[PDB]
């Protein structure tokens, strides 16, 4: 859901950094090469990000938005551990933590969510 | 107006630190000792915060909340017409803000309180 990441980015501080064990090759390599570790990593970072907020019974809050994002990518984690094609790389060395602005993080979060839609190393 | 203050605090990350220049010992000193410096310091820190949020946002906007808070404290900078900078969590910063705001309601004479040194 794309209008909600935009409102989450608009309400996150521009200088607040989100850590993410970015999976190398996202940019050059086919999605099968990285998506499995990218969704796990994104789940963990979004899950950590949700503990930073408290709930507001108003309209969309960062809490509600992040929580919904957590639930989409945790459904993608589950789906990627079913998909039994040995080949879709599921064995990765735990990537190095990288700091990202909310805008960079969520650009990554969006490429990864979309990496599913358009489906050697 | 603390409805929007709790909404902002809930919509800010718990570990996002906010710099405020803070009068040392204003926790135990009479309000007359620090309140002039503190509305100016709180206004400067909040105006600076506007720089970190976007104006384009439906519904709930931290930019619009902070902006209305910038307007309340600026009223007080004009009615009123170091310090060493310290990092605060959103919740702690907003406790000093609600406390500086309340210190105008509960105002008592400077000759009738205490001097302005702690030690």
Residue of A11, A53, A56 lying closest to B57 (CB–CB): A11
User: Resolution of this entry in Å?
Assistant: 2.2
Q: Which residue has the tokens 């107006």?
A: B1
Residue A64 token pair: 């509600």
Residue ranges of domains in chain B, CATH in brackets: 1-119 (1.20.1250.10)
Give CA B21 to chain center in angstroms.
Answer: 10
A108, A111, A113, A116 alpha-carbon torsion, rounded to 10°: -140
Number of neighbours of residue A54 by Cβ within 10 angstroms: 16
- The reply to whether residue A14 touches residue B57, judged by beta carbons under 8 angstroms, is no
Secondary-structure percent of chain B, ordered helix, strand, coil, rounded to 5: 50, 5, 45
Query: Which one, of B37, B45, B57, lies nearest residue B18 by Cα?
Result: B45
**Spatial separation of the C-alpha atoms in residues B94 and B89, rounded to whole Å:** 8
| Chain A residues within an 8 Å CB radius of B62 | 11
Q: Name residue A93's beta-bridge partners.
A: none
Contacts 24+ apart (CB under 8 A), A20-23: A20/A45, A20/A97, A20/A98, A20/A100, A20/A105, A20/A108, A21/A45, A21/A94, A21/A95, A21/A96, A21/A97, A21/A98, A22/A95, A22/A96, A22/A98, A22/A100, A22/A108, A23/A92, A23/A95
Q: Which residues make Cβ contacts (< 8 Å) with residue B12, sequence separation at least 6?
A: A13, A53, B62, B90
Q: Are A105 and A45 in contact (CB under 8 A)?
A: yes
In this structure, what are the phi and psi dihedrals at residue B71, rounded to the nearest 5 degrees?
A: -65, -40
**Residues comprising chain A, all counted:** 121
* Experimental determination approach used: X-ray
| Chain A residues within an 8 Å CB radius of B19 | none
**Spatial separation of the C-alpha atoms in residues A26 and A77, rounded to whole Å:** 17
Q: Are A31 and A113 in contact (CB under 8 A)?
A: no
Q: Name residue B89's beta-bridge partners.
A: none
């Amino acid at each position: 859901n794309v209008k909600d990441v935009t409102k989450l980015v608009a309400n996150l501080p521009k200088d607040y950094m989100i850590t993410l064990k970015y999976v190398p090759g996202m940019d050059v390599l086919p999605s099968h090469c990285w998506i499995s570790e990218m969704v796990v990593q994104l789940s963990d970072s979004l899950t950590d990000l949700l503990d930073k907020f408290s709930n507001i019974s108003e309209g969309l809050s960062n809490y509600s938005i992040i929580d919904k994002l957590v639930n989409i990518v945790d459904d993608l984690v589950e789906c990627v551990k079913e998909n039994s094609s040995k080949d879709l790389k599921k064995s990765f060395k735990s990537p190095e933590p990288r700091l990202f602005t909310p805008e960079e993080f969520f650009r990554i979060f969006n490429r990864s969510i979309d990496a599913f839609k358009d489906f050697d190393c």
